[PDB]
Sequence to fold (1428 residues):
Amino acid sequence: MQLSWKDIPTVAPANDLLDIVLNRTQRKTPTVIRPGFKITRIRAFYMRKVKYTGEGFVEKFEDILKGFPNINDVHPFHRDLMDTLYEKNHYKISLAAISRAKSLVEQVARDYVRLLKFGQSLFQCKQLKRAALGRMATIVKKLRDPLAYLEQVRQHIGRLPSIDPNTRTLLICGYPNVGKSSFLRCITKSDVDVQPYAFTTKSLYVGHFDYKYLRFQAIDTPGILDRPTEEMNNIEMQSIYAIAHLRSCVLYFMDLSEQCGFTIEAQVKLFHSIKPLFANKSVMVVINKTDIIRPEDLD
Amino acid sequence: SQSRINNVLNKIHVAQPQARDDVKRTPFIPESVKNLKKYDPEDPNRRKLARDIEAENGGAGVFNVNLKDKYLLEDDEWKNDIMPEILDGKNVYDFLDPE
Amino acid sequence: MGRYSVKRYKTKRRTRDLDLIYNDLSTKESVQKLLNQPLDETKPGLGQHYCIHCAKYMETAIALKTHLKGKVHKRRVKELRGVPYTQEVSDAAAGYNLNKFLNRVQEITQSVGPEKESNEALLKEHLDSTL
Amino acid sequence: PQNDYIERHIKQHGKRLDHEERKRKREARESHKISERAQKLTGWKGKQFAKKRYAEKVSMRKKIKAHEQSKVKDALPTYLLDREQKFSVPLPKVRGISEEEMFKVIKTGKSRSKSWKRMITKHTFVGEGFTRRPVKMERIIRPSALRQKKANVTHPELGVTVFLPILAVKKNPQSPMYTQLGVLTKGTIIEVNVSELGMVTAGGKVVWGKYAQVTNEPDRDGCVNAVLLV
Amino acid sequence: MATRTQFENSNEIGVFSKLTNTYCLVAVGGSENFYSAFEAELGDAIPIVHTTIAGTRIIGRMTAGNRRGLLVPTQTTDQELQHLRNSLPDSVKIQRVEERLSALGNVICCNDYVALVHPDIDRETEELISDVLGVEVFRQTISGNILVGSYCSLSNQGGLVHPQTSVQDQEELSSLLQVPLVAGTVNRGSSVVGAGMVVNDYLAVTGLDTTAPELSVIESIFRLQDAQPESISGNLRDTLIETY
Amino acid sequence: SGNGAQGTKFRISLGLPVGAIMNCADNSGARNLYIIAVKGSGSRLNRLPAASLGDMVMATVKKGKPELRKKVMPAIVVRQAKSWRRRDGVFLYFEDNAGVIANPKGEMKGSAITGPVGKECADLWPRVASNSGVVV
Amino acid sequence: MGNQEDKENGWTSAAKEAIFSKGQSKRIWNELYKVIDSSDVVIHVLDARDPLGTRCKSVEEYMKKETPHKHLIYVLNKCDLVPTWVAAAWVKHLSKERPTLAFHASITNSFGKGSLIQLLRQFSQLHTDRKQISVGFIGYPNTGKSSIINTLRKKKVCQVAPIPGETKVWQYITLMKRIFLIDCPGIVPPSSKDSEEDILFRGVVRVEHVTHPEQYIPGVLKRCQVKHLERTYEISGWKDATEFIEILARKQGRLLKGGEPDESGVSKQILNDFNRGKIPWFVLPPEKE
RNA sequence: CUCUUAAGGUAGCCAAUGGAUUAACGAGAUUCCCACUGUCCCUAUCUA
Ligand SMILES: Nc1nc2c(ncn2[C@@H]2O[C@H](COP(=O)(O)OP(=O)(O)OP(=O)(O)O)[C@@H](O)[C@H]2O)c(=O)[nH]1
Ligand SMILES: [K+]
Ligand SMILES: [Mg+2]
Ligand SMILES: [Mg+2]
Ligand SMILES: [Mg+2]
Ligand SMILES: [Zn+2]
Fold:
């Protein structure tokens, strides 16, 4: 596996990419050609312009395409998490648009070099070169929305924590405001926030510790509500996918003081509703906030 | 799983000796070693290490340590003595000998 | 300096030393190993037909026999007679480790010498019988 | 670090102590910086700066006009709304092209002494079932890179452009020799396949072939553009 | 009593140092951080000597010895030999050995009582080992691996062999050496344990890259801490199964 | 001065330019190594990259195992026949040119080295010194 | 267990040899498109030993897509090097797709010459309004296009060699007043599944420019029969390629100075014999249905 | 009016051989290998 995708080069928008590639052609290729020179020299000049611009566009597209992960090829946990975060359909459509643009730019470059083989004057060769560069620019301008989407996705996916779905995992789940982030702070050195309102945590947080010289990872999840999956939202789907995919030891945290805003009956109902999730996994129920109320003096 | 059996056994097995002679072999810990005190990096009264001496004198790559300071000689005045090596085409070391 | 000596005694064209050959001939086990060699495809005669004195492979037993009936082989055999001349001899000549040199000389005279001679005689009769 | 750690760090420790003042002074300096850039940048960078400034001013004026206009205040069927998209030719006269411009002399022989072969430098339509003449009897050369099969045809009615296959060359305005050679130049009348345009006669016949006029120079811009003669 | 350090960002402690029960040898290269790392654990209880062997820094690989003696190769200079003699007390015999295999730390793996040697060392070298080190000598290969000094770490308590050693070879070597043996790695997966670490009856020094399970195995087999026997392999079995 | 080398390296006379063939001194099955490049080599017009004792090269195996051949692997030069000066005061040389196969971190593929190993190479590379039986 | 494990030790595969890309140059493919554009009938020449190996499927698809008016036929050459039933089975199987004619090309002792001539006369009669037709010969290198043209002319008008790539440009030959033949350089369509071993055993490259032919010798052992090899080289008793090479070199006296046998030279000679038809071999035809 | 895919299991029938895939020879044209080396890295020195 890879477990981290921070090493993706910056994706420029359409106009910025156009400026970068065209100005690179202007700077890095010679720019003086005279009408008094040989027609072979003139043809070579404009052929070099077309070929160099095409290569620049293609290498930018290839850097985009190689860096981004294959959503289908990754582990199913990562696939479900990235589908929840980024809408896999849009993800694949944008990357496919990049690939199609790369093929079209290559085709334009080949066609116009072949046409420039037969140029008879500087004016005609200049017109053919400008036509090739303009067609490439139109292709690139047709990618404005996918490039912006991919830049946002790259920035977000560079910050995702590295979760190994095959190592030893303590998963933490329950209702909001029960102390999952506080327990993660107590057992690891993660910087998860602890605030007394619902859904303080909107994404998975990872901590680490060592038990008997063995490395364990602890996964704090955003809270789950007792609602059917049709009206379940993406933030809760993060926790649902984590529970379904990570074979681990699950710790369901209960608050008996109802400081969380959910009753003990509601917590038990949520536990029995998410009961089918932890099959063939270790399960444990932890009652937090015992300094306020104890399980012994309950009804 | 039947695959990981021999590999696990060959590294979890601890070999043991057996007799072979009436010879007693015991571990040796010197008295100074077992009376030594544990070093405390954050302590007001601890031993000044050689790196502390180097840092206070010159620092790494500037401090020139004297190796002759650790010599266990009969006389301490002999520590900074230059040992001759050549005399009239002969090596002193292959003539050096008691009696 | 001259071309003949340069292109004969280049370092990459060096031959085995006389003291090494003497050590090979001194012990019976070494002689047996050199007589019974594994089949090597990179050697002349598949590693067989090896003259130990000259440290040289022959393509055939008839070639080995002709080599044995020659003055070059006799020259090497005569060279392999006396003290092997290690560094201790030059040190003793300079006046260094004289007692070590004397002990080595008397060991060669007493124990190593006659055993090497008997091994050479057995090798000679073995080669004469088999060839 | 994981998730939005920079924002969490800003929430937990704040920013640098002079961040707001530094940002405010830089934004105050921006006007002087813009004027100095306009008067100091030279060459291509200066021209690009002027072009971008013009575009920004146009956009700002449009925004002001739209805001003021907002502050002041085809008979399609139901299933089609909420959805989007003289017998004179348009080019009676075009530039004359001489044979010297049309043809290029191709020399043969070891010493290049024979000059009887000619190469057409313009784009051509050779048709179906074309085979090259044997090289010994090949005087007129139409290279394969310059042969065309399709054109971008604009329909005057309905305002669309479709990529259509070429059927024939009807009249090249320069010469009947160019017409029979199939030369595609500006003002050439070609025949195009209009099957995907969905044209039906008054008698119920499906139209799949009509005339169009080439309105560009394919030798210059590498493609054939035409207007359908409806 | 297992510590982790580096000699100038290198994990090969046994290459650049030699540790016995009565003295320690460290290379002179660079600053005094390596010397002070040994000094933090050793105090002034046993001598610690900066030294070079034939001008090189590889003293753990060039030299071999135990609490009673030290053997240096013939490439040692007279000045270095005199430096060692002046730095060490008279209770440690020092001998320069005329041996063809000059990497004594590679060809000899010894403790205070037993020694395993390269099967092609000289008989005079064997007798010199017996006389100077005061030990019994056995010609062995560690599961066919020559260079026992580089492929074994040995003390009077226990021993660590390279991870490709068969069970029968471990049994035979344990019978010969009269100490418990274990197979494992050091410095995060290295099979050159003898050049990876140095050890005595009361201290082990490995590289910084040695993992926690490897350190636990080393502590258990060398009986370093007060509550570390060789029988806690059963208690570490879960961690070792997960780690392997 | 290469990745995995311990410390700086002082200049040694260059003996092996690109195209040279040296013996293989390890036990990995290779018989000889053919030098195709020298790590850390300089840039100069017409000048061939050349290796010396203790240098890391890229080598192909000409003679050896068929599975071992037809690939490029890092190697470390441990013997050279070109004389070089030791700072202690002598020029010295070996009979042959010889190297060992290693990885980019400087770790040996084999388990032992046959024949003498130069002091410069052994002191530069800790794994060579660990696998060496004879050091000069 | 393949590519990923090699990079960990720093091992990189050697650079691909430039000899194995012969038949893929832009010059050669420009010549091919020239002869196809000039041809009314295209003859694809196949080697009867490996006819599916020597098929240019991409060129055939291009012809059926872009130039459907040109007539493409198959000539299975070198039928003398295969058993009669093998050639008959290959003719039957290839006739399900295209008209296929068995052939043995030779100026003096040929087979199929009259059948090919009457077929070309039929094509001329079908194009009686064209005043002439051209027949372009295409196929893999060293399949025998020049030999077939010389057979039809009954005269050495096209240069012929056992080495691949003898023909380098196109050439017009007048067979009759209305029939022209066009000789063309050999082509190798690019592909990723076709390895250097397959390229070498299709007779594409000259063996003198390959690096280590000993690694390709096991391909010879797999493709040939043991009895045929031992009858050709008068040896026996080998168990693998290295011992086969060693026995052959020692029998032939191909020893280098110092005693090591000339493995590369013997291997190059074996590959030359295999490709040139001194060792009998063929690929099995498809099973009858 | 009709024509072509019948042939079958690593060597056939049919008339020693089934051939120009021709030995030998060549200041003819060309590719490769061993050996060899100042062709080269990289130039230095000696004589008339
Ligand atoms: N046995 C046999 N050999 C043939 C036959 N036809 C050609 N050959 C041989 O095969 C080799 C290839 O001959 P070419 O005529 O040059 O083949 P090509 O396809 O023209 O090859 P290139 O011109 O190099 O692309 C020659 O040595 C011929 O003698 C055949 O029908 N039977
Ligand atoms: K040919
Ligand atoms: Mg929370
Ligand atoms: Mg140059
Ligand atoms: Mg040809
Ligand atoms: Zn002899």
Q: What stands out?
A: Residues 56 and 76 of chain F are 5 Å apart (CA to CA). The first strand of chain F starts at residue 16 and ends at 17.
